[PDB]
Structures are given as structure tokens and as C-alpha cells.
From a paper:
Three receptor types have been highlighted: VEGFR3 (also called Flt-4) regulates lymphangiogenesis, VEGFR2 (KDR/Flk-1) is the primary proangiogenic receptor, whereas VEGFR1 (Flt-1) has been proposed as a regulator of VEGFR2. In this study, we showed the presence of a metal site at the dimer interface of X-ray structures of human VEGFR1 domain 2 (hVEGFR1d2) solved in the presence of different divalent metal ions. The three structures are similar and reveal a homodimer with interlocked hydrophobic surfaces buried at the interface and a divalent cation chelated by four histidine residues (two from each monomer). Importantly, the dimer interface involves residues that lie in the core of the hVEGFR1d2 surface that interacts with VEGF-A, VEGF-B or PlGF.
Although the presence of a ligand was not observed in the crystal structure, we observed the unexpected presence of one metal ion characterized as Zn2+ using X-ray fluorescence spectrometry. Contrary to the Co2+ and to the Cu2+ ions, the Zn2+ was not intentionally added in crystallization conditions, but was a posteriori identified by X-ray fluorescence. A zinc contamination arising from laboratory items cannot be excluded or from the putative ligand Laxaphycin B. This cyclic peptide does not possess the peculiarity of some Zn2+ chelating peptides as Cys residues, or thiazole and oxazoline rings. The Zn2+ ion adopted a regular tetrahedral coordination geometry and was coordinated through the Nε atoms of the imidazole groups of His147 and His223. The metal ion coordination site is octahedral for Co2+ and tetrahedral for Zn2+ and Cu2+. The mean estimation for ΔG dissociation was 12.7 kcal.mol-1, 58.1 kcal.mol-1 and 18.4 kcal.mol-1 for (hVEGFR1d2)2-Co2+, -Zn2+, and -Cu2+ respectively. To evaluate this hypothesis, a model of hVEGFR1d2d3 was built, oriented as in the VEGFR2d2d3 template and positioned as observed in the Zn2+ hVEGFR1d2 dimer structure, followed by a GROMOS molecular dynamics simulation performed in the presence of explicit water molecules and NaCl.
Author numbering:
A (entry chain X), B (entry chain X): 132 to 225
Amino acid sequence: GRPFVEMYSEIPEIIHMTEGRELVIPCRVTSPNITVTLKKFPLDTLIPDGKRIIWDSRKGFIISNATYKEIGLLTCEATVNGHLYKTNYLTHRQ
Amino acid sequence: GRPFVEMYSEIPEIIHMTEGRELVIPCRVTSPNITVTLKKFPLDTLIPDGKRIIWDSRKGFIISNATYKEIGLLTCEATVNGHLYKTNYLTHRQ
Ligand SMILES: [Zn+2]
């Protein structure tokens, strides 16, 4: 199946970030009932709290105030129908 | 071993390219005797001719006049001591 509207599982998509600025990780999904986990390689899981990090199923994750900690390989993961899907983004600066 | 001074085998390094401008794929090597192949995913092999594409072991591949065909995942491959090494670059625009 396809939980992510745009899926970059093999080669990451590049997105530009600016520190102090909003960073959208744009892994929007095909249904609002899909649960998505955001990860930063290799160790971190970023939990949305509805403020500093907001999940919107039509957009992806919205990180209000990006920092240098958000520079790297970021992965959205969703498990649907018992299967795990990943889509990958490489963030670096403007 | 390590034929490439900087080696990006697992997560590609990002490099900015501008069309009509020089593009360096910077997979410099640890010895001028190392043979390196340049590839563009998934089908292409780019052959240096000493003019449009120049190999310099201290720099990498120098593509005089980059085009949109050079946008994508580019890989330098070297076989040393019977082992194949790869280093990966994602090119996209300035
Ligand atoms: Zn960039």
C-alpha cells in the first residue's frame, strides 16, 4: 500500500532548513487515521506536542523553530495493515 | 581500506550544482593509482575524456559544464585490493 502521498524510501528527498525558522517535514499521508513516527538518524525520535512540533496529516510535521539538531537524515515511519513504511528526507541549510 | 578521502557510503553528501557551471563531484582518493568510475543512478556511467569531464585524483571529477542530466544520485566507485567501495552524492540546484 501507500500511506505517504510522496514516498522517498530508497533515495532521500532534500529539504532546505533555516535555523530559527519553520521546518516542514512534508510526509503528508493518505488518511488522517495513519499514525506517523518522526525519527532523526540514528538515535532520536521526535514527538509532536502540538506546539513546538505539530503533526498535520495533510502537510507532515511542522517544526516551529528549527535548530541545528534538525540537520541530518529525518525519517517518517508509518505502520499500516501490519507493514512498516518509511520515507526519508535530508535536511540542510539555506 | 579507504580509497576515498571522504567516504559517503550509507547517506549521500549533498552538493549544489548550477546549470552551465562547473560541477565537482568531490570523491578525491588516497592515491593517484586508484581507478574510479563515476555513475548516475540508475543506468548511466560517465566517462572522463580530459575535457568535458576531467578526473583529478586530488579533487574528484570535474564536469566543466553541468546540465540537468547531472541532477540526481551520483556515485564514485573504486575497486582496491579486490574490494568495491562506493561514495554517494546527491546533486541539486543553486
Ligand atoms: Zn541544497
